[PDB]
Amino acid sequence: GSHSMRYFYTAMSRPGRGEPRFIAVGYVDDTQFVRFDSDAASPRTEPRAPWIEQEGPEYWDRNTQIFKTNTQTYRESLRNLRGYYNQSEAGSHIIQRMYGCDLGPDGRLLRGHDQSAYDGKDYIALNEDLSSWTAADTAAQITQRKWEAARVAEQLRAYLEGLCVEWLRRYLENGKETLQRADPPKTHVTHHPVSDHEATLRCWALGFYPAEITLTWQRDGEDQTQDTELVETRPAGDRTFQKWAAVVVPSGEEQRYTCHVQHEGLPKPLTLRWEP
């Protein structure tokens, strides 16, 4: 029901190995739809989802011009931040940016986001009010003054409340067959003896979309949080996701354990047990 759009920018310096690389990727929920890479043989915005291919040359040129300007701006930003932290010209550094809009189940703007990081640490973020900034340190306070002078927050608020929402709604309609289709997980419980008196029960969830899922193990109706080995949700490579949760159970006690699966694609939540 709820949908979001996000752009992810990564700008990485590499002293002695040319100018900094700038990569931008665009997503609607868990689906990537665009990419731009300053390192590509011919840098241009490229489609990464079938429903975006219908956009005209004016869309592709508009995207390419923005990302080519960003490639140059981020090279300047990397030089500036190196200076703000009194860093030597020898090390490689990274600026990351993630921004976008969230829509509620009715399609209205829930909230906007705009966050930047330097070497994986929060640097500057637009507050939820879309009017003020949160600067992490004295270096980020310099960026804050520059961004206030250029009226960045005002420009972002207009984009986040306007163009961001309008274009997300357009993508949701054009890609409705995939973006607005929740694929339920295909589930099963495997059993693997580990010794004479204990075995692993593994609860699988495969082929689901979106990535959001809850897989839990319960022993006599109570959650096994500390005892559950839970892998990170992983992409199958065909748009869908995978996940598993495992518990080491005393031999004979298997029926006291239940796996609970919650996902948007399911008609009702699942209750699974090992079926010998």
Partner: peptide, 9 residues
């Protein structure tokens, strides 16, 4: 569609 303004940090 991405944000159209770029500002040096």
């Amino acid at each position: 569609l991405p944000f159209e303004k770029s500002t040096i940090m």
